[PDB]
């Protein structure tokens, strides 16, 4: 496969760590305690 | 410069959109039968728009050039 | 064993936020609902929204019914594992709504969430998958 200047390979893979990062971070939800009784 | 991008999984469902990637989300039945290279890249294209293309952990991201 | 109804309830309501990438220019809304509920009757336990009252109870015992239709006949499919538990994430449209819903592993519950037709299916379904690896604690509730 190619590489580009408009975007190169490093970039490109970059990039895709950067969204899958973001994403994964911001998929964390804080359980504001435990969910079932009793503990 | 980047016109857009679209990630998409192996199901072929979106994980996001930009550009004019959001107006070409019918582009990812081609682009997921798309065999990438040994490293994960690949180059194609519909039209005037390149599309560079990498998968890595069963997302694959294209970002949308022009030629 | 009881579900701690203001912690499931907190921890719905914080499966509503959306999603701000700042990598590339995009952002969606946040969740119209996210809810917990019966595998058995589609009853609801606990939910979050960001529409009415009256109409999160029809969509529930609607996709808790396609759930279990395509839970037991020998549309996106997700196999996942959590910690050696299998459960399923499946995607319906709703009208113009995105859904996904899972089983928690084990248990009697489904984990429901309601999106807008904006919301990327792909991004639900890891939105999903990550919510259910913080509900370890009601794996195995059973009814």
Redesign the interface.
């Known amino acids: 496969s190619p590489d580009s200047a408009k975007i190169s390979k490093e970039q490109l893979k970059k990039?895709h760590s950067?969204?899958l990062n973001?994403?994964?971070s911001?998929?964390?939800?804080?359980?504001?305690?435990?969910?079932?009784?009793?503990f | 410069d980047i016109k857009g991008?679209i990630?998409?999984?192996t199901?072929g469902?979106?994980?996001?959109?930009?550009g004019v990637g959001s107006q070409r989300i019918e582009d990812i039945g081609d682009l997921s039968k798309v065999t990438l290279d040994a490293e994960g890249f690949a180059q194609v294209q519909g039209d005037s728009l390149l599309v560079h293309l990498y998968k890595r952990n069963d997302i694959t991201l294209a970002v949308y050039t022009s030629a | 064993?009881?579900?701690?109804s203001?912690?499931?309830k907190?921890?719905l309501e914080?499966?509503l936020?959306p999603?701000?990438?700042?990598?590339?220019?995009?952002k969606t809304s946040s969740l119209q609902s996210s809810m917990i509920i019966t595998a058995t009757n589609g009853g609801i336990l606990s939910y979050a929204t960001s529409n009415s009252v009256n109409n999160l109870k029809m969509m529930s015992l609607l996709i808790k019914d396609k759930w279990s239709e395509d839970e037991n006949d020998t549309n996106?499919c997700?196999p996942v594992e959590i910690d050696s538990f299998k459960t399923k994430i499946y995607?319906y449209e709703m009208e113009d709504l995105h859904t996904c819903v899972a089983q928690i592993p084990n248990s009697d519950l489904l984990l429901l969430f309601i999106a807008e037709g904006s919301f990327?299916?792909?991004?639900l379904?890891?939105?999903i998958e990550?919510?259910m690896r913080?509900?370890t604690?009601?794996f195995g509730?059973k009814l």
């Open positions: 990039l950067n969204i973001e994403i994964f911001q998929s964390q939800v804080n359980k504001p305690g435990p969910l079932t009784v009793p | 991008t990630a998409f999984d199901h469902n979106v994980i996001e959109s930009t | 064993v009881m579900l701690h203001k912690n499931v907190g921890f914080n499966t936020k999603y701000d990438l700042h990598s590339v220019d995009f996106s997700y995607t990327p299916y792909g991004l379904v890891i939105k990550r919510a913080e509900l604690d009601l509730y």
